[PDB]
Design a protein around this nucleic acid. Structure first.
Length: 113
RNA sequence: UACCUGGUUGAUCCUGCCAGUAGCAUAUGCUUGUCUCAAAGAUUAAGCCAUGCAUGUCUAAGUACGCACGGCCGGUACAGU
């Protein structure tokens, strides 16, 4: 989930909110950034965030980032939390639409599992 | 540009320092066409010093008998310089 800096002009360029993600003494602090600053990070998370389409970000690390297996999994952990972070936009209540499992069950009553 | 990478082990995750990285100002090595700007015996010995120079000054208007120059003849405030 991508978001904006402090104002709108369409097409989100950065992270919605300031989030973290930890994997066994490594953590990352993805901080939002204004347009055109580029991704300011180490080489390892610069891969992931660039592929994500998050084109602007400030970061900072803490702990042993030498063992990169932790470092990248902790980045990926942070990138997950974006839709698991509650924002005032999402406060309006969902309509609880029926599941595809329910509606399309008619074709699956043959022998299908 | 709010950034990290290598090194303790058979292998893994930490703690931790060492090394790598960029700027700045002094010395030094090697090299060097053209253009502008210019810091420069402070670091150490506020150690010691040859020679040369670096503070003098007169307007119509303080004092002109320089045997100076000049004079158009002088002085009688008395010339001009």
């Amino acid at each position: 989930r991508r978001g904006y800096w402090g104002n709108k002009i369409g097409k989100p360029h950065t992270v919605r909110c300031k989030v973290t993600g930890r994997c066994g003494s490594v953590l990352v602090r993805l901080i939002p950034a204004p347009r055109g600053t580029g991704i300011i990070s180490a080489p390892v998370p610069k891969k992931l965030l660039l592929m994500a389409g998050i084109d602007d970000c400030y970061t900072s690390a803490g702990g042993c980032t030498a063992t990169l297996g932790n470092f990248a999994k902790a980045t990926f952990d942070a990138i997950s939390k974006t839709y698991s972070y509650l924002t005032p936009d999402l406060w309006k209540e969902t309509v609880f639409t029926k599941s595809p499992y329910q509606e399309f069950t008619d074709h699956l009553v043959k022998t299908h599992t």
